Design a protein around this nucleic acid. Structure first.
Ligand code: CL
Ligand code: CL
Ligand code: CL
Ligand code: CL
Ligand code: CL
Ligand code: CL
Ligand code: CL
Ligand code: CL
Ligand code: MG
Ligand code: MG
Ligand code: MG
Ligand code: MG
Ligand code: MG
Ligand code: MG
Ligand code: MG
Ligand code: MG
Ligand code: MG
Ligand code: MG
Ligand code: MG
Ligand code: MG
Ligand code: MG
Ligand code: MG
Ligand code: MG
Ligand code: MG
Ligand code: MG
Ligand code: MG
Ligand code: MG
Ligand code: MG
Ligand code: MG
Ligand code: MG
Ligand code: MG
Ligand code: MG
Ligand code: MG
Ligand code: MG
Ligand code: MG
Ligand code: MG
Ligand code: MG
Ligand code: MG
Ligand code: MG
Ligand code: MG
Ligand code: MG
Ligand code: MG
Ligand code: MG
Ligand code: MG
Ligand code: MG
Ligand code: MG
Ligand code: MG
Ligand code: MG
Ligand code: MG
Ligand code: MG
Ligand code: MG
Ligand code: MG
Ligand code: MG
Ligand code: MG
Ligand code: MG
Ligand code: MG
Ligand code: MG
Ligand code: MG
Ligand code: MG
Ligand code: MG
Ligand code: MG
Lengths: 103, 189, 136, 124
RNA sequence: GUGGCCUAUCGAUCCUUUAGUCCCUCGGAAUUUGAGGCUAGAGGUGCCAGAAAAGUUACCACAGGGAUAACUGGCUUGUG
RNA sequence: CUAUCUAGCGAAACCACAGCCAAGGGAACGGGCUUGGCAGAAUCAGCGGGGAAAGAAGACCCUGUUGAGCUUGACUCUAGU
RNA sequence: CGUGGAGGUCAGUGACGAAGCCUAGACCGUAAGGUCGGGUCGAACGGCCUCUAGUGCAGAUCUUGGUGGUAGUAGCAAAUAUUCAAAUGAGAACUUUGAAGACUGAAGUGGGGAAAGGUUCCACGUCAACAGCAGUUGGACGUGGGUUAGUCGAUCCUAAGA
RNA sequence: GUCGAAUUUGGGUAUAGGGGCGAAAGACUAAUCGAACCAUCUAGUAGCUGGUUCCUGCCGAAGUUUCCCUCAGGAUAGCAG
RNA sequence: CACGGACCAAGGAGUCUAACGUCUAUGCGAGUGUUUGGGUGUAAAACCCAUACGCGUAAUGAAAGUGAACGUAGGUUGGGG
RNA sequence: UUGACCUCAAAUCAGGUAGGAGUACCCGCUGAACUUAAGCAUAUCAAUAAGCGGAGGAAAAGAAACCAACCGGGAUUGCCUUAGUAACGGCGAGUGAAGCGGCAAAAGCUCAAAUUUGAAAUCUGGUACCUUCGGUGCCCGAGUUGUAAUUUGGAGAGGGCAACUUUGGGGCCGUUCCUUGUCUAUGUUCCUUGGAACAGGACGUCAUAGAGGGUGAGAAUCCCGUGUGGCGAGGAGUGCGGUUCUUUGUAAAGUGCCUUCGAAGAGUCGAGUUGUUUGGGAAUGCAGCUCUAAGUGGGUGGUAAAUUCCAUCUAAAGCUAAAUAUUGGCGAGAGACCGAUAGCGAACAAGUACAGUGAUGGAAAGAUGAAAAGAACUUUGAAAAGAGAGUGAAAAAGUACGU
C-alpha cells in the first residue's frame, strides 16, 4: 500500500499548463483537431449572454445551446455511447462516450 | 558493500519496519470530518465564537524573543486590572492562566487593553432567558488580531559619539571573562 | 530478595550476556506484589492504595485499602463513585496505583523521556515510518 | 446521476440484492403497467401483479394472447397465465413462465386493500 | 655536520601515559581540586595495512569441488 | 511348480534424440563427426559383451571465515557448594 | 514488435455473427509480427495519440494438471483337489441341490469370549461400480427387520497410583 | 538356541526431550534417535550449485597492478559503453 | 564416456520503498518549495491561502572566537565572437 | 451471677459481587534465537516474537517538585519540524532522543493535614406508604480509633469595619439526533433482421431523474429504482426554542479595607552498592539489599568534589471530555486491484471430505438452453444401448451438457 500514488507538481508550473490550455481553446484549428464539431460556428471563442446563468430547466438549457451552434457537438455525444472493451465492464466502468462542450 | 565515490548513508531499516508503516490515505477524509465537527459544535454550543480569547506574550529564547504570539491565558493580575474576577472571566469566554507572571509593563498594558476591548464588543445575555437573537461570529481570534509592536520610526538623525561599536562588544566580552580573577586578585590584597 | 530466573539447573541456552541467574531484580516493587495478591483474593473490591507497616529478614508487611463498588454508600458518594466506573477494574493489575505509576516511570521532566506517556507507546511512535499522499 | 450517500451504484451489490431478495420484496419487483383504458380510469401507471388479474401479452412469441393470472411464481420471478401453455410430445400440458414487465393489466381484481393502494397513489 | 661511507635493521584507529602551550571547555554565575580538548612522543600488533581463541569424531551432518587426493585410460621412461 | 502357448485381467523402472562396426582425431576409451568395411520388410524363444545400463545432488578426499556429538587447567561464563 | 488495464479520439466493428479456436490457402515486414479468405462458434471487440504494469519461457532432478513409448509386456505359480448330473438364468470351471473323491484330525480349517470394529447379523429386491479371472453369488448395491434381566456385567470396595 | 525359571504374557499404573529409560548396543522413547514429534520466530543466512521469458542496429572486453584471516570472494587501477 | 531435459498445456524469476551520486527535461531564480494545516468544492479530484520550517545566499577553528576589494574585483600567457 | 467491650468464628442466614469468551487497537510483567558485524564473545536483531496478568469504545497520559537562561514560556495527547542532529558504540558494525517554532484540539480541578463542640449537623439496611433509575415517616445498625459543612497553595482561614450585585427544582408543547414507512416524470408509436428487439431506421416525450439493476441480445422514456420534495410512526437525550406549576430563603455566592495567622503527604526523599535498561556519557529510568533525612526546607538547573550566590518549581495522595490508535465486531460507500492453477485455504452442503494416538495438518470441485420444451411413439437387443421419430434458433447444446 505504501507505493506512491499521488504526484506533487510545482504550483507555478501547474498554472502554466492551465494558462496554455485556456489559450488553446481560442484556436479553431486545435478545437477541430480535438474532435469537436465546431465547423459551422463563426467566431471562436464563443461568448453568450449572462442570462444563461439563470436557466432553471434542462429543456430550455438545451434549447439555448441549440440556438448558439452547439447542436452538432451535443448529438455527437449521444451517438458515441459504447460498451467498454475489457474487464473494466464489471469494475463499475461499463459505458464510454465522448466529451461535449464546456460551459 | 562499499564501492565508488558516494556519500555515506545512514538508513535505519534493520528492524521490522514494515509492520509499522503508516500511510495517510485518509488525509482528505479527516479534513472533511474536522470541518463537520466544527460545524456541529458551533451550531450546538452557543452563538459564542467557538474559541476563547487569548493574550499576547513574548516568545522565549534569544532566537525567537523578537516576536510576540498568542499565549495560554490572562494572568490573575491582568484579569483583576480589567475589572472582573477570574471565576467570572472563565464563564464569559476568556482564557485564564494562573501560573504565568507579569514582569514587563508593556506586555501587561497590552493584555489589559485586549480585555477592555473584548468587553466592549460582546453582549452577555441575561440568565432570565430572553436572549435577543444575534448573529454568530465563528472566530474571536480574527476579531482581535495580534500585531507586532512598533520598534522605531522610519528615519532619524545620525548621532555618533566616536566610540566604536566593535570596540564596545570586545570590552564587554573581555570584562565578563576576567571578572572572577580580578575579584580574587583584589580580595587577596 | 531478588527474583531467581526460573530455569532448570541454571542453563539458559543462549549468549553469555543472558546467562545471569542469581543477581536479577524484579521490575515491580514488593509493594506492588502485595496489592496484586490481595486484589485476586477480593475480586469484588477495588484497590485504592497501600502502605508499609513492618518488615523482617524474610518478609515485608503491607496494609491494602479496598473500596466496595457495589455498596450504596460508595455509589451515592460523589467523591468516591468514580471508582465504580468499569474503566477502573483491577487498577493494581495495570499499574494505575501510586506504586504502579512509580515503577512505570510516569513523571515529568527530562529524566523521564523514555516513559513520559508509556514506554511502549513512545517506542512505537519513534519507530513508525510516516508517509503522506504527497511525499515529503 | 446519483446524489445520495446511502444509495450504491455498485453492480455487484445490485445483482446480489435482486437474486437474494425475500418473498415480500419480490412482490414489488413483479409489477406490471396498466392498460390505456385502465390508466385513464384509475390515474396510475403500474401496480404489483396479483393472482386472478386479467393480463395481455405485448412482447415475445405469445404476443396478443389474454387470460387470467393463475399463479405468481415469485421463486422463479415469473407468472403463469391459464390460457398460455405448451403441449408436450406425450400430451401433457405445462404452463409458460412470463415476466410481468412484458404484460399489460386489462382488468384488476379488487378488494379493500387494493382500493386503498389505488387511493394512496393518488388514483380514483 | 639534521646520526653510523652507500644499499636492510621495523608499526594505524581505540585506550593509557609523558612533554609542550599554561592556552580552550565543564553550557544559570564564580574560585579551587578533578575531568575533558589542542600540538609532539612512548606502551604493539613478526599472520609485520595491525580479529582476543585447544583437541577429537571409526556415531556423524550440510553446501560444493574433478579448481584437488585415493582405480583405469593418456603424455613421460628416471627406475624396472 | 514355473518359464512356454491360449482365454480373461493387466502394472512399473526407465526414456535429449536414438540404436551395426574398424581406425583416426577429439575433454587423451564414439551410436552420431572423418576415412573405410558395409547395408533388405515384419519377427519369436533365450542370453548377460556393450549401452562408461538403472537405483542416490559421493558416505572416502579436499574446499567453506557451514554445523553437530564428545573431551580437556583452550577462551568466556554458570547452577550448586 | 507483442500483452493486461487507464485518459482522449475515430459520432470505429458487431446476432445480416464480436471474441476464441482450426486451416503443407493468399499478401506485407530483414525480424519481433501484422493483414485477408475458408471452416467452427455465439456477445462483445479494435485502429491511432498518450498513461500504467503482477507485460513476452524450452530448460530451473521447476509447480499443478493431463498424456505416451515401454506393453497386451512383467505377471495373476505358498497353504495336497477336484469330478459328474440336474435346477436357475440372455449368459455357469466359480450360484443352488444331489452324487463321488479329499482335507482340517480335539494345542482343529470345531464350539465360545476379551480388546477392537459398528450393523458387517437376518430377510426381500437387485448386478453399473467393488470381490487384481468370472459371477445369476457376496462382509457389495437398494429397502426394511432385529439386541427384552431383582439373580449375567456395569454400578459398590480397595491395589500400585491419581 | 532355550524350554520351571534372572521364565513368558494380558490389563492397570509410574517416568517426557539436554529429559526419560538402559544386565550398556549410543541402544530404545509410535516405520523418526550421537538429542522425538508439532506449530511459530522464518521468505533464518549462504563468498556455494541451478535457473533467469521479444526482434533488429551500432560499439565492444578481462583473467593483469596494490591492499585484505586475501587464495571458489571483495576493494583499487586498467581495459569497455 | 560431464550435468538438467520422455511428452503437452497453463503458471513461473531485477520488484516496491526510505535516503542519495552523475546526467537530462521543466518551472521560477538570490531565491525556491501551495497540498502539516486552513479556505472552498460539481466532494479522496479541481481551485485559493497565512505563519513557520527545510535547503541555498559565508567560511574557518577541538574550542572560546573571528569573519572575505591596495587596484576599472589585480598582473601575465593562450582564447570564440 | 448478669450485662457490655475487643478479637475471632458459624449458617442452604438478607441482599450482592468475581470467574469464562473476545483480544485489531490499549495498560503491565516476562523474554529469546536466527540474523548483522563478511570469523566471534560486548554490541546488533530487540527493550522485538513466543509465554503471563488486566481494560475500554477508545485506552493511557494530564492541570508542573515542567521547560528554560529569554524582553521568558505555562496541563496532557497528536501532526510538521528540530534530526539521522546532541549523544551512545570491539568510537567497529551500528544506534539516537529533547527544549524552542507552526498547527489540530482545548477544561478544569479535590482530598489529607483545623474544635460542629450552644448540640454527628453524616450514612447502609429493615418496614409502611407514595408522585418508584427515587421520596417521606418510623425503627435497628455503622460511626467520635472521626461520618457532614467549611479550606487545597492560583491560595485560604479566624476576628473588625463598609457596601451594593446575583438564583432553585420539575411538567407540557416544539427543535435537534437516531431507528423506519409511504407518496411524488416521460413511447413499449411505425419499418427491417431475429426464436426473442433490449439491435438498425423513422417520428416523439421527460430531465434538479441519461447512477445502477432486471426483463427471451447494447432499454433515460417496459419494471424496480434514480432526482426533487411532501406527509407519517416509534424512541433517545434536557443540548435549547416557547409556554406552564412551584418560591426555593431571616438560604447561598461574589467583591473592598485593617489586623493576627497561614496546619501542605517518611522506611519516603536522598546516599552507597548490585543487576537491568536508556542517546543520557564519574552513572537516564526501574528494582533488590544496606543506611536513612529536613522545614527560610526540599527537588531540578545533562562532568565528579569543597565554598559562596542566583534561577525555577512544590514530590513521596486523587479525578477529568476533545484532537490520537484500531488486520477484531456491527453497519455503509468505493477501486487505473484479481477474474476459477488468479483472488482469502474456501465464488460450491470449506475449515468441509480425508490423514494422524495426539498437538496439528488440510484439498479438489463454478458455465445445457430464453424456456426441460430433459427426447412421446416405432423397431433390434436379456439388458446397457443402437437405428428412426420428435423438441429446439442450434442436439456441431442430450443432465459424461457453452466455446
Ligand atoms: Cl456497444
Ligand atoms: Cl528357441
Ligand atoms: Cl514487421
Ligand atoms: Cl510431554
Ligand atoms: Cl577558532
Ligand atoms: Cl558509569
Ligand atoms: Cl470467505
Ligand atoms: Cl498429526
Ligand atoms: Mg665511521
Ligand atoms: Mg649518511
Ligand atoms: Mg551546568
Ligand atoms: Mg598483511
Ligand atoms: Mg583436473
Ligand atoms: Mg634402464
Ligand atoms: Mg568403434
Ligand atoms: Mg553413446
Ligand atoms: Mg560413413
Ligand atoms: Mg555432490
Ligand atoms: Mg550428499
Ligand atoms: Mg577464505
Ligand atoms: Mg559449533
Ligand atoms: Mg467470428
Ligand atoms: Mg497444422
Ligand atoms: Mg449468450
Ligand atoms: Mg511475472
Ligand atoms: Mg513450458
Ligand atoms: Mg533458457
Ligand atoms: Mg521435469
Ligand atoms: Mg505373460
Ligand atoms: Mg510369481
Ligand atoms: Mg495351492
Ligand atoms: Mg496333513
Ligand atoms: Mg487326514
Ligand atoms: Mg449375511
Ligand atoms: Mg474381477
Ligand atoms: Mg465382471
Ligand atoms: Mg448398502
Ligand atoms: Mg516377561
Ligand atoms: Mg561405539
Ligand atoms: Mg528468496
Ligand atoms: Mg567492431
Ligand atoms: Mg588482518
Ligand atoms: Mg564455480
Ligand atoms: Mg553439477
Ligand atoms: Mg535425466
Ligand atoms: Mg505461459
Ligand atoms: Mg442466603
Ligand atoms: Mg557473523
Ligand atoms: Mg557471511
Ligand atoms: Mg558462525
Ligand atoms: Mg507477544
Ligand atoms: Mg465491551
Ligand atoms: Mg475519541
Ligand atoms: Mg482514562
Ligand atoms: Mg497545582
Ligand atoms: Mg505544554
Ligand atoms: Mg536499541
Ligand atoms: Mg527485563
Ligand atoms: Mg488517571
Ligand atoms: Mg482457489
Ligand atoms: Mg450454434
Amino acid at each position: 500500500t505504501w507505493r506512491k500514488w499521488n504526484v506533487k507538481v510545482n504550483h507555478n508550473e501547474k498554472r502554466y499548463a492551465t494558462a496554455s490550455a485556456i489559450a488553446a481553446t481560442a484556436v479553431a484549428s486545435l478545437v477541430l483537431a480535438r474532435g469537436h464539431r465546431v465547423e459551422k460556428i463563426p467566431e471562436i471563442p464563443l461568448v453568450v449572454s449572462t442570462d444563461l446563468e439563470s436557466i432553471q430547466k434542462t429543456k430550455e438549457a438545451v434549447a439555448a445551446l441549440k440556438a448558439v451552434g452547439a447542436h452538432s457537438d451535443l448529438l455527437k455525444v449521444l451517438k458515441s455511447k459504447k460498451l467498454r472493451a475489457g474487464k473494466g465492464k464489471y469494475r463499475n466502468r461499463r459505458w464510454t462516450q465522448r466529451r461535449g462542450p464546456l460551459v | 558493500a562499499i564501492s565508488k565515490n558516494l556519500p555515506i548513508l545512514k538508513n535505519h531499516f534493520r528492524k521490522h519496519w514494515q509492520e509499522r508503516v503508516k500511510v495517510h490515505f485518509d488525509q482528505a477524509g479527516k479534513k472533511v470530518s474536522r470541518r463537520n465537527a466544527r460545524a456541529t459544535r458551533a451550531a450546538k454550543i452557543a452563538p459564542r465564537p467557538l474559541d476563547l480569547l487569548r493574550p499576547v506574550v513574548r516568545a522565549p529564547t534569544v532566537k525567537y524573543n523578537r516576536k510576540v504570539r498568542a499565549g495560554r491565558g490572562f494572568t490573575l493580575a491582568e484579569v483583576k486590572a480589567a475589572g472582573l474576577t477570574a471565576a467570572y472571566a472563565r464563564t464569559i469566554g476568556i482564557a485564564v492562566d494562573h501560573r504565568r507572571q507579569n514582569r514587563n509593563q508593556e506586555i501587561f498594558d497590552a493584555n489589559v487593553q485586549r480585555l477592555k476591548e473584548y468587553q466592549s464588543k460582546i453582549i452577555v445575555f441575561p440568565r432570565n432567558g430572553k436572549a435577543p437573537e444575534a448573529e454568530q461570529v465563528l472566530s474571536a481570534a480574527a476579531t482581535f488580531p495580534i500585531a507586532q509592536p512598533a520598534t522605531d520610526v522610519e528615519a532619524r538623525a545620525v548621532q555618533d559619539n566616536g566610540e566604536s561599536a566593535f570596540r564596545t562588544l570586545r570590552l564587554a566580552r573581555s570584562e565578563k571573562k576576567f571578572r572572577g580573577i580580578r575579584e580574587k586578585r583584589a580580595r587577596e590584597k | 530478595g531478588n527474583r531467581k530466573r526460573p530455569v532448570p539447573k541454571g542453563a539458559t541456552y543462549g549468549k553469555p550476556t543472558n546467562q545471569g541467574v542469581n543477581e536479577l531484580k524484579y521490575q515491580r516493587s514488593l509493594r506492588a506484589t502485595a496489592e496484586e495478591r490481595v486484589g485476586r483474593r477480593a475480586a469484588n473490591l477495588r484497590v485504592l492504595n497501600s502502605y508499609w507497616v513492618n518488615q523482617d529478614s524474610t518478609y515485608k508487611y503491607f496494609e491494602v485499602i479496598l473500596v466496595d463498588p457495589q455498596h450504596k454508600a460508595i455509589r451515592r458518594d460523589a467523591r468516591y463513585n468514580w471508582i465504580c466506573d468499569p474503566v477502573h477494574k483491577h487498577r493494581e493489575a495495570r499499574g494505575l496505583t501510586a506504586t504502579g505509576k512509580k515503577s512505570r516511570g510516569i513523571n515529568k521532566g527530562h529524566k523521564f523521556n523514555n516513559t513520559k506517556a508509556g514506554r511502549r507507546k513512545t517506542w512505537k511512535r519513534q519507530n513508525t515510518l510516516s508517509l503522506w499522499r504527497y511525499r515529503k | 446521476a446519483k446524489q445520495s450517500l446511502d444509495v450504491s451504484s455498485d453492480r455487484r451489490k445490485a445483482r446480489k440484492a435482486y437474486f437474494t431478495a425475500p418473498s415480500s420484496q419480490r412482490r414489488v419487483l413483479l409489477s406490471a403497467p396498466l392498460s390505456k383504458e385502465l390508466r385513464a380510469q384509475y390515474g396510475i401507471k403500474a401496480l404489483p401483479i396479483r393472482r386472478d388479474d386479467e393480463v395481455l401479452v405485448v412482447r415475445g412469441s405469445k404476443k396478443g394472447q389474454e387470460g387470467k393470472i393463475s399463479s405468481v411464481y415469485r421463486l422463479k420471478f415469473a407468472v403463469q397465465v391459464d390460457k398460455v401453455t405448451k403441449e408436450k410430445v406425450n400430451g401433457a400440458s405445462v404452463p409458460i413462465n412470463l415476466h410481468p414487465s412484458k404484460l399489460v393489466i386489462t382488468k384488476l381484481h379488487l378488494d379493500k386493500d387494493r382500493k386503498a393502494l389505488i387511493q394512496r397513489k393518488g388514483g380514483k
